[PDB]
Automatic annotation (TrEMBL), chain A:
SUPFAM superfamilies per the UniProt record, alphabetical: Translational machinery components
Record note on quaternary structure: Part of the 30S ribosomal subunit. Interacts with proteins S7 and S18. Binds to IF-3.
Species for this entry: Staphylococcus schweitzeri
Positions in coiled-coil regions: none
Keywords: Ribonucleoprotein, Ribosomal protein, RNA-binding, rRNA-binding
Superkingdom of the source species: Bacteria
Gene3D superfamilies in the record: Ribosomal protein S11
Family stated for the protein in its record: Belongs to the universal ribosomal protein uS11 family.
Pfam families named among the record's database cross-references: Ribosomal_S11
One biological process term in Gene Ontology: translation
InterPro entries hit by this protein: Ribosomal_uS11 (IPR001971), Ribosomal_uS11_bac-type (IPR019981), Ribosomal_uS11_CS (IPR018102), Ribosomal_uS11_sf (IPR036967)
Protein name: Small ribosomal subunit protein uS11
From TrEMBL, chain B:
GO MF assignments: rRNA binding; structural constituent of ribosome
Species: Staphylococcus aureus
A Pfam family the protein falls into: Ribosomal_S15
Domain of life: Bacteria
SMART domains: Ribosomal_S15
Name recorded for this polypeptide: Small ribosomal subunit protein uS15
UniProtKB/TrEMBL annotation, chain D:
Cellular component per GO, a single term: large ribosomal subunit
Name recorded for this polypeptide: Large ribosomal subunit protein uL2
PROSITE patterns reported in the protein's UniProt record: RIBOSOMAL_L2 (PS00467)
Family: Belongs to the universal ribosomal protein uL2 family.
Classification via SUPFAM superfamilies: Nucleic acid-binding proteins, Translation proteins SH3-like domain
TrEMBL record, chain E:
Matches recorded under NCBIfam families: S6
Keywords: Ribonucleoprotein, Ribosomal protein, RNA-binding, rRNA-binding
Organism the protein comes from: Staphylococcus schweitzeri
Annotated gene: rpsF
Gene Ontology MF term list: small ribosomal subunit rRNA binding; structural constituent of ribosome
Protein's name in the database: Small ribosomal subunit protein bS6
PROSITE patterns reported in the protein's UniProt record: RIBOSOMAL_S6
Cited Pfam families: Ribosomal_S6 (PF01250)
Length: 115, 87, 55, 275, 92
RNA sequence: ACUUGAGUGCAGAAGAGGAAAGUGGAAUUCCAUGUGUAGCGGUGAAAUGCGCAGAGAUAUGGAGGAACACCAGUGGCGAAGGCGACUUUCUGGUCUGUAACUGACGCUGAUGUGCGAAAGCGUGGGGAUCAAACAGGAUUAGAUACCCUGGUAGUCCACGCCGUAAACGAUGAGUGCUAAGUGUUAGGGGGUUUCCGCCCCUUAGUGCUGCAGCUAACGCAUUAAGCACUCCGCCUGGGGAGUA
RNA sequence: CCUGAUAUUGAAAUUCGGCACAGCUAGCUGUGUUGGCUUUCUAACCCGCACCACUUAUCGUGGUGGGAGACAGUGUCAGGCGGGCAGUUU
């Protein structure tokens, strides 16, 4: 008994996580790149995020869903290659939201790099 | 600081000479009205030091005007020391 | 009216995507009249007259 | 602050006193003093309970108002006197009824103050008013615990508390030991931090003035032969040889918790202690 | 000199306690030798974001003139105990 | 006796120059419940580790502490070290135009004395992130190395000290002087002042390009490393050695 | 000392499992009976909680409150730690 929801996708340069939820954020189904079996340097491959967004779509069409809003963030690739997989698995996508925790200048970054 | 509606009063009670905004008498009298007021900021606040460079600066300016005044007038040099308490 | 901060012309000239201030080159402002228009926005955001992040 | 000493003797080598600059009218008020006979751990059987007590200097108890009644009467503050029974100093307020009383003194206090429940009650240092009428983030001390009982928690020198929020019937207090705790909403609270804050740097410096305060020596355990301490003798000095260091009556003392399942303290203590 | 004191009042307290706050605040903003310039409002208006989860609030502006220096910090110590303001600001 | 230097008065602006007190937003970490569930991470590759006892993902929640996105740029300021969220009280110096003002009242400074980036130390608070020391996995024939999840003194505040750096323009201060073009910031001169339109000028900081001159060469070159004057500091082959 | 089982010890509920197979498609539905987890209310019980009387006693009992509440204290039974202490062997 659900009509509309939100389709979170989060694709860092070492993993890919899709979490299609309800409007409160209640987890309908999630489909990570590690879930499909991309054990290795395939989580850095943009092909893996393509099929990582479509395991969660039909797992959310059986709970009832038409129109979602998409929230993405990632320094790595797959940030827009995987959103159109929601179209290629039968799910209406209209709104795109680029949330990114860009800080207001505090809490110093890690300094592992030694040039 | 001292405002410029009250700075003018400092000149008038130290006019041994007539209609002089700058003298070996009157600006020395103005400097003491700041030294007595900078040094009461500097008995409440102490961590600042840019004021305490302006504090050292203004006195050694007066020590050159006063040592000029020692070498012109015998009884006007001694009057200005006795009038305010400043040495 | 570059002076006071309780007007709506601050809302209509300097926003890009988050409410971030547009530079002095792209808008075409002056230099003296950027300092009167900078901190006046900082007082404008503190009284909820304009958003820090708008969308 | 602390007035130091100069090492004219080996006794006064590092001894450090506490300068009495916040004391006015050094003579007491001869109508609020009650006598105080000592006892070193001598209960109603004459035996010895609690150890290391007794002797020193004679004292005389000074009657303190912890209740804070006399609602809606302006109380001046006259003189800030010295109290030996406790770590804070003391005050001599005068209500406008001429009823001179004692108050434990907060941080800065010479002016004149008010006790009233909710009239306006004038939130300043020295004013006592119930915890439903106190806004959040407000440093209080000398809280009551049971309603109308008397102020119990945080009465030391330099102690404090903090109101956090307001729950359905209680309030929520952070104590000085770091233990969040619910208190009923009609307990009073003095607003402020209690004075005499330089107290724990008083280096006593000498085994004699640590001895006329009412303290006796404390013999360590490993020098008693094993009639009377579980760290008994052995040839030479000896490591303790137990799995756990024990108190002189058998119970392990280093680590094991001691409180029991108690009424009206499990449903109220949210956070524990931090040490 | 000239000041201005602005304070955003939270809603649903000025149908009965209207001028039980603002008259007492302008009974303490306007004291110690202060014939004010103008005491007016801007209205129950729109906020740009949420403040303690209030989307709107009353705006009231008091533009006070005196020649005493720090006789207005009573309002900066009355706006804490009064939980009937949600933000405030003094300029000049 | 003189008024160009040096000082005040009056007319005006531009400031991240200090010092106390409040106040505000966004991200990081940890605690409370759900929906939810086999992976989250990390990487040349991998793991060590946290997870299946319900982790990350995901929402409201509340606890703290610290920095201060966008404006922000060659800009500004202070003698330097340095100083960038906002409001308030207190507080130094510099500059533009000059009618006024006593009338050489100067420049330099051996000792003295006062501020000093960070690290470090002393006695108290407070401790999110980053993180020497430290334990761990592999890379290495060997590995605190470099790489990875972890991590304490320290980082922040208040008080008292230690005074060094590629503390640099690698160029000590003070005065006058000598071809010119092109920017930029705060002010003043000629216009109906056209408003960030415009050119016409004069003064002070600020950068670039470039004669005569000087330089071993590089390159400076009106903010001289040019022509001169005053006073101060220092050097005399490289190690031994800023050691005894 | 710690922890259960029952006694003193009452009502209101809301879900969750064992039977019972009640519907008759491994898992649904819903009645007859059993054992829990919680959640809230007050009537016992408890207060080294406030004035008030016995009384010009900070002991006690009696009295309207305010708190906490079928948990705690207590009785019987049962399990686990127990050189703190005892009886003896070597
Ligand atoms: Mg430091
Ligand atoms: Mg034995």
């Amino acid at each position: 008994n659900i009509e509309n929801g939100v389709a979170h996708i989060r694709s860092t340069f070492n993993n890919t996580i899709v979490t299609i939820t309800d409007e409160f954020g209640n987890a309908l189904s999630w489909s990570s790149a590690g879930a499909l079996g991309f054990k290795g340097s395939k989580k850095s491959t943009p092909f893996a995020a393509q099929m990582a967004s479509e395991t969660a779509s039909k797992s959310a069409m059986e709970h009832g869903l038409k129109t979602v809003e998409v929230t993405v963030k990632g320094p790595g690739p797959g940030r827009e290659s995987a959103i159109r997989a929601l179209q290629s698995a039968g799910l209406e996508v209209t709104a795109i939201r680029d949330v990114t925790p860009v800080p207001h200048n505090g809490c110093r970054p890690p300094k592992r790099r030694r040039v | 600081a001292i405002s410029q509606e009250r700075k003018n009063e400092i000149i008038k009670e130290y006019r041994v000479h007539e209609t002089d905004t700058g003298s070996p008498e009157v600006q020395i009298a103005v400097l003491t009205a700041e030294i007595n007021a900078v040094n009461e900021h500097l008995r409440t606040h102490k961590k600042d030091h840019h004021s305490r460079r302006g504090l050292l600066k203004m006195v050694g300016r007066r020590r050159h005007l006063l040592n000029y005044l020692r070498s012109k007038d015998i009884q006007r040099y001694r009057e200005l020391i006795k009038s305010l308490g400043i040495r | 009216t570059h002076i006071d901060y309780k007007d709506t012309e601050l809302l209509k000239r300097f926003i890009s995507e988050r409410g971030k201030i547009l530079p002095r080159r792209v808008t075409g402002t002056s230099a003296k009249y950027q300092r009167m228009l900078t901190t006046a926005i900082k007082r404008s955001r503190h009284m909820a007259l304009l958003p820090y992040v708008k969308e | 602050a602390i007035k130091k000493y100069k090492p004219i003797t080996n006794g006064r080598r590092n001894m450090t006193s506490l300068d009495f600059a916040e004391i006015t009218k050094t003579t007491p008020e001869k109508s609020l003093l009650k006598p105080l006979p000592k006892k070193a751990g001598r209960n109603n059987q004459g035996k010895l309970t609690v150890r290391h007590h007794g002797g020193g200097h004679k004292r005389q108890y000074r009657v303190i108002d912890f209740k804070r009644n006399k609602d809606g009467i302006n109380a001046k503050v006259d003189s800030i006197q010295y109290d030996p029974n406790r770590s804070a100093n003391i005050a001599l307020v005068v209500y406008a009824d001429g009823e001179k009383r004692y108050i434990i003194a907060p941080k800065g206090l010479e002016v004149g103050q008010i006790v009233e429940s909710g009239a306006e009650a004038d939130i300043k240092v020295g004013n006592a008013l119930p915890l439903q009428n106190i806004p959040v983030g407000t440093v209080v001390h000398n809280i009551e615990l049971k309603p109308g009982k008397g102020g119990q928690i945080a009465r030391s020198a330099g102690a404090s508390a903090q109101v956090l929020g307001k729950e359905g019937k209680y309030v929520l207090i952070r104590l000085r030991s770091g233990e969040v705790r619910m208190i009923l909403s009609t307990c009073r609270a003095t607003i402020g931090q209690v004075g005499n804050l330089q107290h724990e740097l008083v280096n006593v410096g000498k085994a004699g003035r640590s001895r006329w305060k009412g303290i006796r020596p404390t013999v360590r355990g490993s020098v008693m032969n094993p009639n009377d301490h579980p760290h008994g003798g052995g040839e030479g000095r000896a490591p303790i040889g137990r799995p756990s260091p024990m108190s002189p009556w058998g119970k392990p003392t280093l680590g094991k918790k001691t409180r029991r399942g108690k009424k009206s303290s499990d449903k109220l203590i949210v956070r524990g202690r931090k040490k | 000199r000239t000041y201005e004191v602005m304070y955003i009042v939270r809603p649903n307290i000025e149908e009965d306690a209207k001028k039980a706050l603002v008259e007492r605040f302008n009974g303490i903003l306007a004291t110690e030798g202060a014939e004010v310039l103008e005491a007016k409002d801007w209205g129950k208006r729109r906020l740009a974001y949420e403040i303690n989860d209030f989307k709107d609030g009353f705006y009231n502006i008091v533009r006070v003139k005196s020649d005493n220096n720090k006789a207005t910090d009573e309002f900066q110590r009355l706006a804490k105990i009064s939980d009937d303001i949600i933000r405030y600001m003094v300029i000049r």
